[PDB]
Every structure is written in C-alpha cells, then in structure tokens.
Design brief:
Helix content of chain A: 25-40%
Protein name (chain E): Major capsid protein
Order of helices and strands of chain A: HHH
Strand order of the largest sheet of chain B: 1-7-6-2
Number of strands of chain B: 9
GO cellular component, one term (chains A, D): host cell nucleus
Radius of gyration of chain A: 20 Å
Organism (chains A, D): Human herpesvirus 1 (HHV-1)
Protein name (chains A, D): Small capsomere-interacting protein
Shape of chain A: elongated
Distance between the termini of chain A: 36 Å
Organism (chain E): Human herpesvirus 1 (strain 17)
Number of helices of chain A: 3
Oligomer: part of a larger assembly
Largest sheet of chain A: none
C-alpha cells in the first residue's frame, strides 16, 4: 500500500492492486508535507513515469468490470479483415451506444 | 487602405463565407469560459486518426453540449481537428451545426485555388514545382507553426543541396521515432527525437516515408497563417504543453458501476448513476473537469478514454531551421544569407486569455511561446509567472518573440503583416483574400 | 539564438538576460507602424537611409 | 432567554440556544417601547456586535440540521490539494444542486 | 456635435456594441422596480473571489428570474461583478443572456486599445512610461470612484 | 478580495495592473453614457445588511 508523500513507495503493483475507486480517494487523503529523506531511485521524474503505468493498468482492469455490459469492439478501418480477396474491409465509426441489458 | 482594395480583387465571386458562420467563429475567439477540457483534448487526440475514430462519442457530445451553451464552433485552432470532423462526423451533429464546419473547410480549398489562377504552366526549375516559386504557401521552405507530424519535415529535406535545408530541433538533428507507449514514456529526454504517431492504423507504420498527401501541409499553412490571424486580430499565440499532467488529469477516472438490471443514465441532474452528479464529483478528477465547462457527457463514453494508454506523446520542442533563398532568386550577391522560420512540434494555439481564472494555476499546463510575431498575445505573455514588472508597458506595444524562435529580419513574414491585421476594417470575408494578396513573393 | 535546453525555460532565459536591452532606445520597425505616409517622407525620422 | 427591548440582555448564548426558527419569532413578538434603565455595557453599538455573533453561530447550527441532506463540499480553487507533485489542483465551481435522497 | 464627430472618428469598426444589448441595458438603468435584493448582494459579495465562487448558484437564479420577468441585464453597476459573472458563470445562464455581459467586457477591452494605438513609443519619464502620460485612464493619479 | 486563504498578504496588490484600468474606463465612460447622469454613489450601512 503506497503513501503518496513518499516518492520511493509508488510502484505499478501498488497502484494496480488498489482499485480505481480507491486510487482516487488515496491521493485525496494524503499528506501535504512531502518527505525528502528517501527519493525515488529514478528521480522524481521517474516516479511520475511509474505512476502513470498503474493508471492505464487499472483502466483495463476497470474495462473488464464492464465486460458484461459492453460489446465486442469491431475494427475501425479498412485493411484489417481476414477474408479480403472476396469481400473488402469496412470499419464501424464508433458512434453508437454500446450497452447490454 | 490599399491592401483592402487589393483584397477586393479576389472577392469577385470565388467564395463567400456566410455571416451566420462568421459569428460562430468570432465567439470561439472571445469566450473567457471557453471550457478548458477542449484544450486537454487537443493535447489528447493530438492529430491522430485512430484516437479520433474512438473518441467520436465524446467529441460529438462535447460539441452538441457546447452548441447549446454559447452557440460557437469548437476545436477551431486545429485544422487537423476541423478536417477530421468534416470527413467523419456526418450524421450525428445536427443540420445547422455542420453548416459552420464546411465554411471553414470549403473556404480553405477556395484559398488554395488563388495560387492556381495566377501561375503559368511552367516546368520545374530547382527541383521544385512552378506553383511553389510564386506564392509562399506552396513552398516547403516554410513550416506550419503547429506540427503533430513530420510531414512538412520529410518533404523539406528532399530539396536540393543548393538550398541549405537543416532543422536544429534544440541543438540536435531530428531523429524520427515510430510510436510512443506506456513503457517508452521518458517525459524529459533531450535527444532530437520527434514522433510520427498520427497514422491510419497500427500496421501502416513507417519512417522512411511521410504519412499524408503533399497538399495537406499547404492546407495547414493556409489555415494557420491566413484564417487564424484574420479572426483573432492579433490577440492569440501558441503555447507549449506540459504532457506530464494532461495524461494524468484525463486518467483520474471515476466511473460508477451500472447495475445489471438497470439502464444507462442520461441525466446530469436527477440520477446518481451519472458521472456529472455531485455524488460522483470528487475533487481534482476527470468528472470534475467536465462539470467545470458544463459539458454533458454520457456514461459509457467516458470508458472510451483508454485509447490514450496506447498513443502517448513526448513533449513540445522548439524548431529552428535554415533556408537559402529561391531557386529563381539565387544571385551570388544573395548566397551569404538565410531565412529562419519558427515552429513548435506538438503545440497548441491559445485563443482567449484565461489568466483571470483562479481554479487552475498559471504554470500548470500551457507555458506560452510567441513563435511568430503574428502570434504574440498582449495578455498571454505578460501573465506567465516570473514575468519581470519593468516590461508591462513594453509588452503592450511590441511583440515579445525570442530569437530562439526566429526574430523579425531573419524570418519570412516580417512585422507589418501584424499591424495590417489590426488597422483594417474590411470584415472577415475580405481579409482572408487580402492577406493572400500579400503573401506573394518578390 | 540557437535553441538550448528544454522549451519550458526558453522564455525565462530570454527575459532574464534581455531585460536591460529592451529599454535603451527606440525599436525601428515598430516605430514605422505609427507613420503617416507623408511623415515617413519627411526628414523627421532617422530611418530614411 | 433574551428580551429584545432590553439591550443588556442580548448575548451569544442567549441567541444561539434559541433556534433559528425561534430567533425570528422572538424579535417579531417583542415590545415597541425600548427601556433605557440598563444599557449594554459596551454601548448600544456593542449590542449590535453581540447580536450578529449569535446568528452566524446558529446558521452553522442550521447547516448541521441539513448534514443528512447535503454533500461534503469540495474546495473551490487550485493550490489546495494534498497530492500536488504528481497531479495538479482543480476546483469545482459550485453550480450543481447538492441534495441527498 | 463636434465631440460627436470626434466620437464617430474612432468608430471605423474597432467595436460596435450590439443593439440587442442596448435595450437590455437602457432598461436596467431605468427600472423603478429594480429589486433591492440585487443591491443587498453587492455589499455581501463585496468584490471577493471566495464569496462569489461560493454564491455561484445564487447569482444565477437572481439573473435568470430577472431575465425572465423584465428581460434586462442585472448587476450592471459593479464592473468587479461584471467580469465575475462573465469569467465564471458560463453554462448556467441562457445563451442569449451571455451575449450581453460579453458585450460589456469585450467593449471595455476594445476601449483599452484606444490608448495604445495613439501613443508614440518612447523611454520612461518620471517613474511612469510613455503611454501612461497620454490618456487619463492610464494614470494611477486617478482612482475609480468605487473601489473594493 | 483574494483567491484563497493561503495567498493572504498586505505588501502588494492582489490582481493584475490592467484590472484597475478597466474600472476607470467603466465608471468614467461607460456608466454615465447610459444613465444620462441619473445615477449616484452611496455609502452602505453594513449593520442592517
């Protein structure tokens, strides 16, 4: 479990194991005073790189919580189709409302 | 009083932008609550085909929400974002909404044919097209001021060596990468490295060739140097964009779970299952950001933001370049000089001065950069932090372009094109021809 | 000038070193913007030659 | 319990212990004749200062009667956020309708 | 009429205020039932950011109801209150009401450039710079007659 | 009239320098042009407010 006033604590698996609903509330309940006794080993800029790796890993975890509610997304452009020498390739402009009752 | 009468020479029935589509553009350069979400999306969609064809449900419901709050056009400063809506978003915007977006596109291709009426049929001269060596907007010697690509950069280096075509992108020669991902972030690298992310699909990924047509850069150079200064009257400028926080403040996602027997919410007032309801407005979140601009967004359209996990972007870099004069002008008394044009790879032009907000600090996202003398805001530059107080009366008269982005005399467009914009009264239809009447070479 | 370092500090290095250069005398090209086309022909300005 | 025709009776705890619904009806049911036998020890202007201290203390008591109906108010401006070195600070323009069913 | 022809001399299209925003302002200076609630707020906001961004709902329902009972623009007498309803209250008012308040701010910022187009560019004189000594509104010797 | 309680000081003006320029334009030019001089300024009794 990470503590966001300590830069050398943020990892991917600390962010990803925390839920997206929990990720927001953890950062909003942290401490104002930043500790400088132990920095991140890749620098403070490396911790920002480390932090965004956990969000995109949790949004894909968030999308799998809605797999019983959305559809299988079709490809968007031409040129990506298995049977191409007899029928050509379309692509759905994703303008509809994917929702499953 | 003379250029405006010369500007009426091309207004003899080529194209007229309708007055109902003028004021829908002027307002977008005047909104002090233009919602700052759209500035994040211009840093998010960032010129790409694949990102735009997933975020269609957002961008329609961002425009149609903005259509019912101010009645102005959206995404105006990016011709790449104008042209993608006019190609893709056909039957989801209303009938009345599409009328503005064509008169910002079909006007531009009428501006491109101004070249094609005053140029004779000639052969190539210095390995270059004959239509280039008359009018400035056809030359690849220039660059568009906001380039999400290397499309103008690929075609420039293919010129002959008699015109010195080098680009010093921050002291280093430009190296062209392929793509950017989660594990290739490196947000502060200092190589001469630029992106080529904007592609039709993933498999069509090349760096030995440019990805788009050759007229495409001419459509931008017309849009950013003629259309944009004709509206803003010299009250706009470019800016460099901190990508560190934009990918953060778009992925502060709070998405409520939908019950498996219920239905999709569509009400930002009544129901609590909606991501703009106050029981889901957690501070410093993405749902807080859409409520800031009163942008009505549907529920599962928020889930489509995951495309930003695949197509990242590095940073904004400065772009200086040298250029020898024309092939039909290279006298030996002229070989000893150059012409330096400024550009920003992956930048965003600001429209209205939002320095009077106190809900977002100044040095958060958009550090301003006055690239060209046409783009130098009187309130934009003089409200960035650490501005010295002995210049606030100096900042008002003169523009404030640094010579790290090209000065007056070593650029292409000098000072007085700026002052012709402010001191004219021709209207928004005659200036876009009268400016074109000034970009002809000598 | 050559572009050195990141573009974030590019404006800051400008105003911190040029602050005493911008207030010596008149700028030539901005001063032409407030010229009557008969005043520009008069010997008033020193930008004839 | 205060009597508003007597200036030396109004205190904070006399106003605050009376309800806001009762504060209005007490002043509207007072006497027209003002007594001058005993003024307020800080003067008549000090009693006006003493009286406004009870209203703001009772409105906060009034707001706690609606804590089961309103939300937790978020900060309005930037610069007030615990986790600031990785994500910046927004602020909700309070234009919504805070109400709890 | 001589000052009027000089007044029309600057009217070569710098800015023209919309005529729909004149009768929404000619009304506001002439309503005998201009409600005193609209005055009672102006001592309570007292020019502050923090009070206005807290009262950002109560300003809306006062404007919309007054826009739906007389059709005039409210809160005109305080420029500090003009460019707060402009710069913060965008997507609460109707579209038609927003155009009035922008024609009261962008008009003044168009009036600000009247000074700057008429000043020769020069060095400073007395602790003040060259464009300040020309037009009266640039001098700090004045004060606005209502300052919060 | 401040943004937030952390930015509280008395050594400086808390807004831009052009802000008071827009007031002087508003009250000496705009307001008398509409009212035809039928307005007045007032002192406000903050006790009964």
């Amino acid at each position: 479990v990470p503590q966001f006033h300590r830069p050398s604590t943020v990892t991917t698996d600390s962010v990803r194991a925390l839920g997206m609903r929990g990720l927001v509330l953890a950062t909003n309940n942290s401490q104002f005073i930043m500790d400088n006794n132990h920095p991140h080993p890749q620098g403070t800029q490396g911790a920002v790189r480390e932090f965004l790796r956990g969000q995109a890993a949790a949004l894909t975890d968030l999308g799998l919580a809605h797999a019983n509610n959305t559809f299988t997304p079709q490809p968007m452009f031409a040129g990506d189709a298995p049977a191409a020498w007899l029928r050509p390739a379309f692509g759905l402009r994703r303008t509809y409302s994917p929702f499953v009752v | 009083a003379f250029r405006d009468a010369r500007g009426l020479e091309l207004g003899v029935g080529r194209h007229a932008m309708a007055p109902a589509t003028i004021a829908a553009v002027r307002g977008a350069f005047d909104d002090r609550n233009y919602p700052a979400v759209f500035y994040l999306l211009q840093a998010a969609i960032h010129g790409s085909e694949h990102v735009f064809c997933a975020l269609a449900r957002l961008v329609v419901q961002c425009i149609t929400s903005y259509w019912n709050n101010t009645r102005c056009a959206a995404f105006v400063n990016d011709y790449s974002l104008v042209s993608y809506v006019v190609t893709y978003l056909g039957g989801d915007l209303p009938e009345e909404c599409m009328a503005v977006y064509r008169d910002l596109v079909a006007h531009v291709e009428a501006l491109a044919q101004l070249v094609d009426d005053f140029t004779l049929t000639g052969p190539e001269l210095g390995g270059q097209a004959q239509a280039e060596l008359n009018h400035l907007m056809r030359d690849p010697a220039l660059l568009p001021p906001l380039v999400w690509d290397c499309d103008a950069l690929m075609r420039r280096a293919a010129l002959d060596r008699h015109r010195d075509c080098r680009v010093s992108a921050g002291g280093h020669d430009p190296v062209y990468a392929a793509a950017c991902n989660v594990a290739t972030a490196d947000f502060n690298r200092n190589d001469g490295q630029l992106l080529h992310n904007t592609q039709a699909r993933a498999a069509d990924a090349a760096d030995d060739r440019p990805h788009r047509g050759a007229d495409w850069t001419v459509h931008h150079k017309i849009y950013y140097y003629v259309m944009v200064p004709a509206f803003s009257r010299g009250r706009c400028c470019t800016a460099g964009v901190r990508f560190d926080r934009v990918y953060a403040t778009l992925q502060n996602m709070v998405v409520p779970e939908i019950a498996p027997g219920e239905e999709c919410p569509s009400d930002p007032v009544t129901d609590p299952a909606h991501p703009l309801h106050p029981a889901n407005l957690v501070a410093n979140t993405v749902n807080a950001m859409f409520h800031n601009g009163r942008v009505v967004v549907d529920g599962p359209a928020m889930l489509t933001l995951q495309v930003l996990a695949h197509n990242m972007a590095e940073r904004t870099t400065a772009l200086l370049c040298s250029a020898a004069p024309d092939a039909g002008a290279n006298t030996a008394s002229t070989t000893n000089m150059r012409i330096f044009d400024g550009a920003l790879h992956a930048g965003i032009l600001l429209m209205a001065p939002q320095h009077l907000d106190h809900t977002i600090q100044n040095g958060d996202y958009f550090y301003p950069l006055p690239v060209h003398a046409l783009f130098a805001g009187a309130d934009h530059v003089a409200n960035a932090p650490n501005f010295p107080p002995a210049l606030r009366d100096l900042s008002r008269q003169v523009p404030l372009v640094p010579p790290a982005l090209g000065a007056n005399y070593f650029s292409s467009i000098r000072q007085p094109v700026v002052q012709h914009v402010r001191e004219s009264a021709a209207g928004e239809n005659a200036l876009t021809y009268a400016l074109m009447a000034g970009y002809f070479k000598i | 000038a050559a572009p050195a370092g990141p573009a974030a500090d590019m404006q800051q290095l400008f105003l911190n070193a040029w602050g005493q250069r911008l207030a010596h005398g008149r700028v030539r090209w901005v001063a032409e913007g407030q010229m009557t086309p008969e005043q520009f022909m008069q010997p008033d300005n020193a930008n004839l030659a």
